[PDB]
Design a protein around this motif. Structure first.
Motif, PDB file in Angstrom:
ATOM      1  N   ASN A  49       0.814  -1.209   0.000  1.00 50.37           N
ATOM      2  CA  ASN A  49       0.000   0.000   0.000  1.00 50.37           C
ATOM      3  C   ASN A  49       0.850   1.262   0.000  1.00 50.37           C
ATOM      4  O   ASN A  49       0.521   2.230  -0.673  1.00 50.37           O
ATOM      5  N   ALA A  53       1.091   4.273  -2.730  1.00 48.64           N
ATOM      6  CA  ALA A  53       0.954   5.681  -2.404  1.00 48.64           C
ATOM      7  C   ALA A  53       2.124   6.523  -2.930  1.00 48.64           C
ATOM      8  O   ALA A  53       1.941   7.669  -3.357  1.00 48.64           O
ATOM      9  N   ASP A  88       4.744   6.011   5.388  1.00 48.62           N
ATOM     10  CA  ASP A  88       5.267   6.323   4.051  1.00 48.62           C
ATOM     11  C   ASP A  88       5.154   7.827   3.803  1.00 48.62           C
ATOM     12  O   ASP A  88       4.337   8.523   4.416  1.00 48.62           O
ATOM     13  N   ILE A  91       1.439   9.781  -1.242  1.00 51.14           N
ATOM     14  CA  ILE A  91       0.425  10.782  -1.592  1.00 51.14           C
ATOM     15  C   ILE A  91      -0.522  11.136  -0.434  1.00 51.14           C
ATOM     16  O   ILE A  91      -1.130  12.203  -0.423  1.00 51.14           O
ATOM     17  N   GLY A  92      -0.639  10.243   0.537  1.00 54.35           N
ATOM     18  CA  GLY A  92      -1.512  10.497   1.677  1.00 54.35           C
ATOM     19  C   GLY A  92      -2.989  10.408   1.325  1.00 54.35           C
ATOM     20  O   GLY A  92      -3.365  10.096   0.177  1.00 54.35           O
ATOM     21  N   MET A  93      -3.831  10.655   2.321  1.00 51.26           N
ATOM     22  CA  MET A  93      -5.286  10.503   2.156  1.00 51.26           C
ATOM     23  C   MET A  93      -5.986  11.803   2.521  1.00 51.26           C
ATOM     24  O   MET A  93      -5.708  12.392   3.580  1.00 51.26           O
ATOM     25  N   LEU A 102     -12.389   2.969   3.269  1.00 53.12           N
ATOM     26  CA  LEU A 102     -12.584   1.704   3.985  1.00 53.12           C
ATOM     27  C   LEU A 102     -13.750   0.949   3.379  1.00 53.12           C
ATOM     28  O   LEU A 102     -13.706  -0.273   3.245  1.00 53.12           O
ATOM     29  N   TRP A 161      -7.040   9.253  12.527  1.00 52.75           N
ATOM     30  CA  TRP A 161      -8.122   8.302  12.218  1.00 52.75           C
ATOM     31  C   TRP A 161      -7.964   7.118  13.152  1.00 52.75           C
ATOM     32  O   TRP A 161      -6.914   6.480  13.153  1.00 52.75           O
ATOM     33  N   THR A 181       1.271   8.850   5.054  1.00 52.94           N
ATOM     34  CA  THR A 181       0.426   8.078   5.959  1.00 52.94           C
ATOM     35  C   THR A 181       1.239   7.281   6.957  1.00 52.94           C
ATOM     36  O   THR A 181       2.178   6.552   6.583  1.00 52.94           O
TER      37      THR A 181
HETATM   38  N1  LIG Z   1      -0.349   3.938   3.097  1.00 58.07           N
HETATM   39  C1  LIG Z   1      -1.522   4.299   2.404  1.00 58.07           C
HETATM   40  N2  LIG Z   1      -1.510   5.416   1.672  1.00 58.07           N
HETATM   41  C2  LIG Z   1      -2.570   5.822   0.986  1.00 58.07           C
HETATM   42 CL1  LIG Z   1      -2.561   7.241  -0.010  1.00 58.07          CL
HETATM   43  C3  LIG Z   1      -3.763   5.046   1.066  1.00 58.07           C
HETATM   44  N3  LIG Z   1      -5.036   5.134   0.517  1.00 58.07           N
HETATM   45  C4  LIG Z   1      -5.707   4.067   0.988  1.00 58.07           C
HETATM   46  O1  LIG Z   1      -7.044   3.808   0.668  1.00 58.07           O
HETATM   47  N4  LIG Z   1      -4.964   3.315   1.795  1.00 58.07           N
HETATM   48  C5  LIG Z   1      -5.367   2.111   2.517  1.00 58.07           C
HETATM   49  C6  LIG Z   1      -6.381   2.622   3.601  1.00 58.07           C
HETATM   50  C7  LIG Z   1      -5.909   3.428   4.620  1.00 58.07           C
HETATM   51  C8  LIG Z   1      -6.796   3.927   5.602  1.00 58.07           C
HETATM   52  C9  LIG Z   1      -8.123   3.641   5.561  1.00 58.07           C
HETATM   53  C10 LIG Z   1      -8.629   2.831   4.540  1.00 58.07           C
HETATM   54  C11 LIG Z   1      -7.755   2.318   3.571  1.00 58.07           C
HETATM   55 BR1  LIG Z   1      -8.550   1.234   2.249  1.00 58.07          BR
HETATM   56  O2  LIG Z   1      -8.769   4.270   6.653  1.00 58.07           O
HETATM   57  C12 LIG Z   1      -7.726   4.741   7.470  1.00 58.07           C
HETATM   58  O3  LIG Z   1      -6.524   4.737   6.708  1.00 58.07           O
HETATM   59  C13 LIG Z   1      -3.722   3.898   1.877  1.00 58.07           C
HETATM   60  N5  LIG Z   1      -2.609   3.543   2.559  1.00 58.07           N
END
Ligand SMILES: Nc1nc(Cl)c2nc(O)n(Cc3cc4c(cc3Br)OCO4)c2n1
Length: 223
Positions: A49, A53, A88, A91-93, A102, A161, A181
Protein backbone atom coordinates in the motif's frame (compact mmCIF):
# COMPACT_ATOMS: atom_id res chain seq x y z
CA UNK A 1 20.42 6.28 11.29
CA UNK A 2 17.64 7.76 9.19
CA UNK A 3 14.31 7.83 11.04
CA UNK A 4 11.13 9.77 10.42
CA UNK A 5 8.68 8.05 12.79
CA UNK A 6 8.04 9.83 16.10
CA UNK A 7 5.12 10.83 18.33
CA UNK A 8 4.88 14.33 16.86
CA UNK A 9 1.21 14.51 16.07
CA UNK A 10 -1.23 16.42 18.21
CA UNK A 11 -5.02 16.30 18.21
CA UNK A 12 -6.18 19.81 17.27
CA UNK A 13 -9.85 19.36 16.41
CA UNK A 14 -12.87 17.56 17.79
CA UNK A 15 -13.90 14.04 16.81
CA UNK A 16 -16.27 13.01 14.04
CA UNK A 17 -17.81 9.56 14.32
CA UNK A 18 -18.40 7.32 11.31
CA UNK A 19 -20.18 3.97 11.27
CA UNK A 20 -18.89 1.16 9.05
CA UNK A 21 -20.75 0.32 5.87
CA UNK A 22 -22.99 -2.65 6.54
CA UNK A 23 -20.72 -5.12 4.73
CA UNK A 24 -17.33 -3.74 5.82
CA UNK A 25 -17.12 -5.82 8.99
CA UNK A 26 -17.91 -8.97 6.99
CA UNK A 27 -15.03 -8.17 4.63
CA UNK A 28 -12.67 -7.41 7.53
CA UNK A 29 -13.60 -10.81 8.95
CA UNK A 30 -13.04 -12.69 5.70
CA UNK A 31 -9.60 -11.12 5.21
CA UNK A 32 -8.66 -12.19 8.73
CA UNK A 33 -9.88 -15.78 8.17
CA UNK A 34 -8.03 -15.91 4.86
CA UNK A 35 -4.69 -14.69 6.15
CA UNK A 36 -4.43 -16.03 9.72
CA UNK A 37 -2.19 -18.94 8.72
CA UNK A 38 0.37 -16.42 7.39
CA UNK A 39 -0.63 -13.46 9.53
CA UNK A 40 2.83 -11.87 9.22
CA UNK A 41 1.86 -11.02 5.65
CA UNK A 42 0.06 -7.89 6.94
CA UNK A 43 3.47 -6.18 6.89
CA UNK A 44 3.89 -6.93 3.18
CA UNK A 45 0.30 -5.78 2.55
CA UNK A 46 0.97 -2.41 4.19
CA UNK A 47 4.33 -2.01 2.45
CA UNK A 48 2.58 -2.67 -0.86
CA UNK A 49 0.00 0.00 0.00
CA UNK A 50 2.84 2.39 0.85
CA UNK A 51 4.55 1.67 -2.46
CA UNK A 52 1.27 2.36 -4.25
CA UNK A 53 0.95 5.68 -2.40
CA UNK A 54 4.51 6.63 -3.45
CA UNK A 55 3.73 5.77 -7.09
CA UNK A 56 0.65 8.01 -6.94
CA UNK A 57 2.81 10.84 -5.56
CA UNK A 58 5.31 10.20 -8.37
CA UNK A 59 2.67 10.75 -11.01
CA UNK A 60 1.34 13.86 -9.28
CA UNK A 61 4.83 15.32 -9.26
CA UNK A 62 5.56 14.33 -12.85
CA UNK A 63 2.52 16.22 -14.06
CA UNK A 64 3.33 19.12 -11.68
CA UNK A 65 6.83 19.36 -13.20
CA UNK A 66 8.47 18.92 -9.80
CA UNK A 67 11.37 17.02 -8.23
CA UNK A 68 10.88 13.76 -6.33
CA UNK A 69 11.21 14.42 -2.58
CA UNK A 70 12.24 11.95 0.12
CA UNK A 71 10.11 9.00 -0.97
CA UNK A 72 10.51 6.38 1.71
CA UNK A 73 8.85 3.58 3.67
CA UNK A 74 9.64 3.30 7.38
CA UNK A 75 8.89 0.59 9.94
CA UNK A 76 9.19 1.08 13.70
CA UNK A 77 8.83 -1.47 16.48
CA UNK A 78 8.09 -0.66 20.10
CA UNK A 79 8.30 -3.66 22.41
CA UNK A 80 7.35 -1.63 25.48
CA UNK A 81 4.17 -0.22 23.91
CA UNK A 82 3.37 -3.40 21.99
CA UNK A 83 3.19 -1.65 18.63
CA UNK A 84 4.37 -1.88 15.06
CA UNK A 85 4.22 1.25 12.91
CA UNK A 86 4.58 1.88 9.17
CA UNK A 87 4.94 5.38 7.71
CA UNK A 88 5.27 6.32 4.05
CA UNK A 89 5.96 9.73 2.51
CA UNK A 90 3.58 9.10 -0.38
CA UNK A 91 0.43 10.78 -1.59
CA UNK A 92 -1.51 10.50 1.68
CA UNK A 93 -5.29 10.50 2.16
CA UNK A 94 -7.74 13.39 1.91
CA UNK A 95 -10.54 13.82 4.41
CA UNK A 96 -12.92 12.27 1.87
CA UNK A 97 -10.66 9.30 1.35
CA UNK A 98 -10.33 8.78 5.10
CA UNK A 99 -14.14 8.75 5.30
CA UNK A 100 -14.82 6.63 2.23
CA UNK A 101 -11.95 4.38 1.32
CA UNK A 102 -12.58 1.70 3.99
CA UNK A 103 -16.00 1.05 2.50
CA UNK A 104 -15.17 1.25 -1.21
CA UNK A 105 -15.75 -2.46 -1.89
CA UNK A 106 -18.93 -2.60 0.21
CA UNK A 107 -20.31 0.37 -1.74
CA UNK A 108 -19.22 -0.59 -5.26
CA UNK A 109 -20.00 -4.29 -4.87
CA UNK A 110 -18.02 -7.12 -3.28
CA UNK A 111 -18.86 -9.85 -5.81
CA UNK A 112 -15.71 -9.52 -7.93
CA UNK A 113 -13.47 -9.62 -4.84
CA UNK A 114 -15.26 -12.53 -3.18
CA UNK A 115 -15.29 -14.48 -6.46
CA UNK A 116 -11.56 -13.90 -6.92
CA UNK A 117 -10.89 -14.97 -3.35
CA UNK A 118 -12.98 -18.11 -3.84
CA UNK A 119 -11.30 -19.14 -7.08
CA UNK A 120 -7.85 -19.03 -5.47
CA UNK A 121 -6.10 -18.59 -8.82
CA UNK A 122 -3.46 -16.61 -6.95
CA UNK A 123 -2.41 -16.29 -3.31
CA UNK A 124 -5.13 -14.85 -1.08
CA UNK A 125 -2.61 -12.24 0.05
CA UNK A 126 -2.11 -11.10 -3.54
CA UNK A 127 -5.85 -10.96 -4.31
CA UNK A 128 -6.50 -8.95 -1.16
CA UNK A 129 -3.76 -6.49 -2.10
CA UNK A 130 -4.97 -6.18 -5.70
CA UNK A 131 -8.55 -5.35 -4.75
CA UNK A 132 -7.27 -2.56 -2.55
CA UNK A 133 -8.11 -4.07 0.81
CA UNK A 134 -4.61 -4.76 2.09
CA UNK A 135 -5.36 -2.25 4.87
CA UNK A 136 -7.94 -4.73 6.15
CA UNK A 137 -5.02 -6.91 7.25
CA UNK A 138 -3.99 -4.22 9.76
CA UNK A 139 -7.10 -5.00 11.77
CA UNK A 140 -6.55 -8.71 11.86
CA UNK A 141 -3.43 -8.23 14.04
CA UNK A 142 -4.66 -5.19 15.98
CA UNK A 143 -6.58 -4.43 19.14
CA UNK A 144 -6.81 -0.95 17.65
CA UNK A 145 -5.41 0.99 14.71
CA UNK A 146 -4.19 4.57 14.89
CA UNK A 147 -3.67 6.39 11.55
CA UNK A 148 -2.24 9.85 10.76
CA UNK A 149 -2.53 11.01 7.14
CA UNK A 150 -2.22 14.19 5.14
CA UNK A 151 -2.77 14.36 1.40
CA UNK A 152 -0.31 16.03 -0.95
CA UNK A 153 -3.28 17.81 -2.55
CA UNK A 154 -3.26 21.58 -1.98
CA UNK A 155 -5.12 22.68 1.14
CA UNK A 156 -5.27 19.20 2.65
CA UNK A 157 -5.40 19.10 6.46
CA UNK A 158 -3.71 16.49 8.65
CA UNK A 159 -5.94 13.96 10.39
CA UNK A 160 -5.99 11.37 13.10
CA UNK A 161 -8.12 8.30 12.22
CA UNK A 162 -8.86 5.76 14.98
CA UNK A 163 -10.68 2.43 15.08
CA UNK A 164 -10.74 -0.82 17.04
CA UNK A 165 -12.20 -2.46 13.94
CA UNK A 166 -15.56 -3.25 15.55
CA UNK A 167 -17.96 -0.92 13.71
CA UNK A 168 -16.99 2.73 14.17
CA UNK A 169 -14.02 4.90 13.25
CA UNK A 170 -13.21 8.40 14.45
CA UNK A 171 -11.56 11.33 12.67
CA UNK A 172 -10.01 14.45 14.22
CA UNK A 173 -7.80 17.15 12.73
CA UNK A 174 -4.19 16.84 13.91
CA UNK A 175 -1.13 19.07 13.80
CA UNK A 176 2.31 17.78 12.90
CA UNK A 177 1.22 15.25 10.30
CA UNK A 178 3.79 14.69 7.56
CA UNK A 179 2.48 14.37 4.00
CA UNK A 180 1.83 10.66 3.56
CA UNK A 181 0.43 8.08 5.96
CA UNK A 182 1.45 6.64 9.32
CA UNK A 183 -0.29 3.52 10.67
CA UNK A 184 0.28 2.53 14.29
CA UNK A 185 -0.90 -0.98 15.12
CA UNK A 186 -1.58 -1.76 18.77
CA UNK A 187 -1.00 -5.48 18.53
CA UNK A 188 -3.42 -8.21 19.59
CA UNK A 189 -2.43 -10.47 22.47
CA UNK A 190 -1.41 -13.30 20.12
CA UNK A 191 0.46 -10.93 17.78
CA UNK A 192 3.05 -9.35 20.08
CA UNK A 193 5.90 -10.93 18.08
CA UNK A 194 5.57 -8.08 15.61
CA UNK A 195 6.79 -5.59 18.19
CA UNK A 196 10.14 -7.42 18.09
CA UNK A 197 12.72 -5.82 15.81
CA UNK A 198 14.40 -9.15 15.13
CA UNK A 199 11.15 -10.84 14.15
CA UNK A 200 10.11 -8.01 11.84
CA UNK A 201 13.57 -7.98 10.23
CA UNK A 202 13.34 -11.74 9.64
CA UNK A 203 9.94 -11.32 7.99
CA UNK A 204 10.67 -8.29 5.80
CA UNK A 205 14.14 -9.20 4.56
CA UNK A 206 12.56 -12.02 2.51
CA UNK A 207 11.18 -9.44 0.06
CA UNK A 208 12.71 -6.04 0.90
CA UNK A 209 14.85 -6.06 -2.24
CA UNK A 210 11.65 -6.06 -4.29
CA UNK A 211 10.77 -2.58 -2.96
CA UNK A 212 11.47 0.41 -5.26
CA UNK A 213 11.95 3.16 -2.69
CA UNK A 214 14.19 3.18 0.40
CA UNK A 215 12.80 0.89 3.15
CA UNK A 216 13.88 1.40 6.77
CA UNK A 217 13.40 -0.50 10.01
CA UNK A 218 14.02 1.58 13.12
CA UNK A 219 16.14 3.98 11.08
CA UNK A 220 18.19 1.22 9.41
CA UNK A 221 18.13 0.72 5.64
CA UNK A 222 16.80 -2.68 4.55
CA UNK A 223 17.43 -2.39 0.82
N1 LIG B 1 -0.35 3.94 3.10
C1 LIG B 1 -1.52 4.30 2.40
N2 LIG B 1 -1.51 5.42 1.67
C2 LIG B 1 -2.57 5.82 0.99
CL1 LIG B 1 -2.56 7.24 -0.01
C3 LIG B 1 -3.76 5.05 1.07
N3 LIG B 1 -5.04 5.13 0.52
C4 LIG B 1 -5.71 4.07 0.99
O1 LIG B 1 -7.04 3.81 0.67
N4 LIG B 1 -4.96 3.31 1.80
C5 LIG B 1 -5.37 2.11 2.52
C6 LIG B 1 -6.38 2.62 3.60
C7 LIG B 1 -5.91 3.43 4.62
C8 LIG B 1 -6.80 3.93 5.60
C9 LIG B 1 -8.12 3.64 5.56
C10 LIG B 1 -8.63 2.83 4.54
C11 LIG B 1 -7.75 2.32 3.57
BR1 LIG B 1 -8.55 1.23 2.25
O2 LIG B 1 -8.77 4.27 6.65
C12 LIG B 1 -7.73 4.74 7.47
O3 LIG B 1 -6.52 4.74 6.71
C13 LIG B 1 -3.72 3.90 1.88
N5 LIG B 1 -2.61 3.54 2.56
Amino acid sequence: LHSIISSTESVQGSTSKHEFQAETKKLLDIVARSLYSEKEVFIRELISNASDALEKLRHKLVSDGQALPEMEIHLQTNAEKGTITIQDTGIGMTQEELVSNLGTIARSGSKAFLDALQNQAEASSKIIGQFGVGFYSAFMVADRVEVYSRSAAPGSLGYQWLSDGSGVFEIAEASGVRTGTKIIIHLKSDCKEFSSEARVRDVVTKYSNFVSFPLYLNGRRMN
